């Protein structure tokens, strides 16, 4: 959930 | 914070990619969140020092701070040589 790449 | 950052570098494919993601000062730690880049299979876990320091670097003065570029331990001679310009063996975190 923390990253978005 | 909380703080918008991205970490830029090239995936296995070679290829450029922006990361986007969240640090929260006071919650989150930049150990902490580069081991969760390292978990999520974003960074090489031989980068986990380098990232982490840096991290550190912008998180702490995202004032002045507004990008890092870094060396990555895994591509010290991995096959391409390290070339900044082109974040070859190196990355680079920014503010969003």
Redesign the interface.
């Known amino acids: 959930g923390?990253?978005?790449? | 914070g909380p703080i918008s950052l991205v970490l830029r570098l090239r995936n296995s494919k070679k290829e450029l990619?922006?990361?986007?993601?969240?640090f929260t000062p006071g919650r989150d730690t930049a150990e902490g969140?580069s081991q969760?880049?390292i978990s999520?299979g974003?960074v090489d876990g031989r980068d986990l020092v380098i990232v982490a320091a840096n991290l550190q670097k912008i998180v702490e003065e995202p004032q002045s701070n507004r990008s890092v570029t870094f060396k990555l331990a895994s591509g010290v001679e991995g096959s391409d040589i390290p070339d900044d310009g082109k974040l070859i063996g190196f990355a680079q975190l920014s503010i969003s």
Do not use: H, P, T
């Open positions: 923390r990253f978005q790449v | 990619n922006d990361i986007r993601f969240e969140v969760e880049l999520a974003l």
